[PDB]
């Protein structure tokens, strides 16, 4: 039904929000510290000097294990 | 249709996977460091000396800003 189409769209949007903001292909699993923005996969987070969201200096990257992985 | 019911169940499970595994009421937004398990809200994470997934000591809690928030 039309309701099935609405639910498919909600699911698709939530799943897309879990993907890396740089490559759009891999799941987010890395946090820039200390700011806390968690928006990249490990590969894309590895060479950024500053956060792509807030511009804060990246002191290090913390790996995150999420139940949605 | 029956697919509407199946999609409602998938969406409910994905949403539940984003809620704190301890209180079940607030969104996950905290990482136990250094292990990286990101399973709690800030209120539950502040009360745990050991990670509830792996039992490693919590040295500190890192707040995470996720695009799904
Ligand atoms: Zn990436
Ligand atoms: Zn940031
Ligand atoms: Zn909680
Ligand atoms: Zn742990």
Q: Is residue B69 part of a domain?
A: no
Q: Is residue B6 part of a domain?
A: yes
Rounded to whole angstroms, the Cα distance separating B68 from A8 reads: 17
Q: Is residue B22 part of a domain?
A: yes
Rounded to whole angstroms, the Cα distance separating B59 from B11 reads: 34
CB distance A11–B8 less than 8 Å? no
For residue B8, give the 3-state DSSP assignment.
helix
Q: How far is CA A41 from CA A24, B1, B42, in A?
A: 9, 37, 23
Q: Is residue A9 part of a domain?
A: no
Q: How far is CA A38 from CA A54, B5, B60, in A?
A: 11, 32, 17
Task: Check: CB of residue B62 under 8 Å from CB of residue B33.
Answer: yes
CB distance B4–A3 less than 8 Å? yes
Rounded to whole angstroms, the Cα distance separating A60 from B27 reads: 25
Rounded to whole angstroms, the Cα distance separating A68 from A39 reads: 14
**Structural domain containing residue A23:** 18-69
Rounded to whole angstroms, the Cα distance separating B4 from A60 reads: 44
Q: Is residue B35 part of a domain?
A: yes
What experimental approach yielded this model? X-ray
Q: Map tokens 């969104």 to a residue.
A: B27
Candidates A3, A21, A67, A69: best to mutate against B (most CBs of B within 10 A) is A67
Residues within 8 A of B (CB atoms), A 5-34 only: 7-8, 10-11, 14-15, 17-18, 21, 28, 31, 33-34
Rounded to whole angstroms, the Cα distance separating B4 from B60 reads: 43
Structural domains of chain B, count: 1
Q: Is residue B19 part of a domain?
A: yes
Residue B33 CB neighbours (<10 A): 19
Candidates A27, A62, A63, A69: best to mutate against B (most CBs of B within 10 A) is A62
Task: Examine residue B34 and say whether the peptide bond preceding it is cis (omega within 30 degrees of 0).
Answer: yes
Q: Is residue B20 part of a domain?
A: yes
Q: What string of DSSP letters covers A13-60?
A: HHHHTTB-TTTSSSB--EEEETT-B--B-HHHHHT-SB-TTT--B--E
Rounded to whole angstroms, the Cα distance separating A7 from A44 reads: 31
Q: Is residue B68 part of a domain?
A: no
Q: In the 8-state DSSP scheme, what is residue B50?
A: B
Which residues, including other chains, have CB under 8 Å from residue B29's CB and lie 6 or more apart?
Answer: B41, B42, B63, B64, B65, B66, B69
């Amino acid at each position: 039904s039309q309701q099935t189409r609405v639910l498919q769209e909600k699911l698709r949007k939530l799943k897309e929000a879990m993907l890396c903001m740089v490559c759009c292909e891999e799941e987010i699993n890395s946090t820039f510290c200390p700011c806390g923005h968690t928006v990249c996969c490990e590969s894309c987070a590895a060479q950024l000097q500053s956060c792509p969201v807030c511009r804060s200096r990246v002191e290090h990257v913390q790996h995150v294990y999420l139940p949605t992985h």
